[PDB]
Design a protein around this ligand. Structure first.
Ligand SMILES: NC(=O)CN1CCN(C(=O)c2ccco2)CC1
Length: 284
């Protein structure tokens, strides 16, 4: 029984290595990573890989690993797939912990934009969770934390993190993690997966996929939003992605919005993430 070595980048930046039989389905490796992580609430998470077009693909747990990674290395990342709209309702603190680690990377990467004050607040809860109570001994007037808090660090941001950290004395890690999430969950780009696209006139837009529905980011004076209820049908053909939108009450026929994606694989990838979000948030 021939086994392939898998390398998985965990959300704390460490590497987990394991072996699976070479014809294994994605679920086999995912189960192994989740067991390693002591993670029970597995539904919110998945494994990604970087392709030959160099983009992120979700590893489909139901399909053979080799038919997905094809010519590529068996190298993966562990990631949040479905961001819970209300993390307080997750049953375990360890689930909330991994969601925090993902969101910290979302913030540092600039995928999740954040005001100065919210960067400092989120940072202050991370420090409280990781170091415990503020201690002046390992913080002078010139202190800079090892923690990455933001896409661009400033001494002002470091100072504000410390000021807010002082206010959290006696907070336990699970409590600080819950505060982090109560703030993060409100950010306008929380849990939004962004895809580059062109509208039916060739104008560059972004399409956002989230729990609630679909977002079309045009010029920022115009953001169109389609709640999952309003979306009739999702489809792709060639480099095109089509959304069928319900008629308003007393209308005879749906509207179709068409988008052009960079290539056929980018269209298929958008289609599959939308179907998965539609299913997941239909059941929540
Ligand atoms: N007064 C309002 O209802 C404002 N509301 C419009 C739609 N909202 C969503 O639930 C959403 C996010 C993506 C698709 O739909 C966000 C903000």
């Amino acid at each position: 029984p021939k086994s392939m070595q898998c390398k998985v980048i965990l959300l704390d930046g460490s590497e987990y290595t394991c072996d699976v039989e070479k014809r294994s389905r994605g679920q086999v490796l995912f189960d192994k990573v989740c067991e390693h992580l002591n993670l029970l609430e597995k539904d919110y998470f998945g494994l990604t890989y970087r392709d030959a077009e160099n983009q992120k693909n979700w590893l489909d747990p139901a399909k053979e690993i080799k038919k997905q990674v094809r010519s590529g290395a068996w190298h993966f990342s562990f990631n949040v797939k479905f961001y819970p709209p209300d993390p307080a309702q997750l049953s375990e603190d360890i689930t909330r912990y991994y969601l925090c680690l993902q969101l910290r990377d979302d913030i540092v990467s600039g995928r999740l934009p954040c005001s100065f004050v919210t960067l400092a607040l989120l940072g202050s809860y991370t420090v409280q969770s990781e170091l415990g109570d503020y201690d002046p001994d390992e913080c002078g007037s010139d202190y800079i934390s090892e923690f990455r808090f933001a896409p661009n660090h400033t001494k002002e941001l470091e100072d504000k993190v410390i000021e807010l950290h002082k206010s959290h004395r006696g907070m336990t890690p699970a409590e600080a993690e819950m505060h982090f999430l109560e703030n993060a969950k409100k950010l306008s780009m929380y849990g939004v997966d962004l895809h580059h696209a062109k509208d039916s006139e060739g104008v560059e837009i972004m399409l956002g996929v989230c729990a609630s529905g679909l977002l079309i980011y045009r010029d920022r004076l115009r953001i169109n939003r389609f709640a999952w209820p309003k979306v009739l049908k999702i489809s792709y053909k060639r480099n095109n992605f089509y959304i069928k939108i319900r008629p308003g009450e007393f209308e005879q026929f749906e509207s179709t919005i068409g988008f052009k994606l960079p290539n056929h694989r980018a269209a298929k990838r958008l289609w599959k993430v939308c179907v998965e979000h539609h299913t997941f948030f239909r059941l929540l």
